[PDB]
Amino acid sequence: ARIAGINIPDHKHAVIALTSIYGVGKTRSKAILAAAGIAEDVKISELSEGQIDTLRDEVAKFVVEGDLRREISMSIKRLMDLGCYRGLRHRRGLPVRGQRTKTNARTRKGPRKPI
Template sequence: MVFILGTNFNEARLVRKTLQSFYGVGPQVCARLLARLYIHPTARLGSLNSQTVLDITSILSEMKIENDLRRELRENISRLKSMGTYRGKRHAMGLPVRGQNTRNQTNSAKKLNRVERIG
């Protein structure tokens, strides 16, 4: 087992998939991180030495990921709501925010904005 940022991962897992499991680390950020540390995209966690794992952990700890990023997103949406902007009102009603069609296809927006209707 490899321990990265408070989470245990199996050694047979791909490094790329492991990094992308963190909220805020997508394919592009992951590719840049792997290139920066000279890690092959198909490398497994078990093949990394302990220093490389420590380097990955230190770089991830400097980035804004997981709860910090979620908190910032929540604060931005609540700021829009408190200002009374159009986007804030749409978030509050659970409707599409970025100009999508509302006549037929609002189900996904209602699902995604459901959490934000609390505030």
């Protein structure tokens, strides 16, 4: 059933049914079900409407989805704008060599590719 960032865990046990969320997994599965008092051997189609409610509110308080991915992008952009080799490593569009890469290097690259 619906829980966090659009998830459709159907025809699965209450356990792994949550182990499909990029946020929670196994450890988080046993803890969330033990705190809300829910059988771990019950399918998601047998779960009452009151059990899922107490499961959504508790799991709601967590970090997931885009808001998290953007933080990753910023973390890869901060060291990218600086003079760090690691930042240039993420790009890899920089010279892999020892001669120049800016120009005169089609002997290894071949036909000029589009910018």
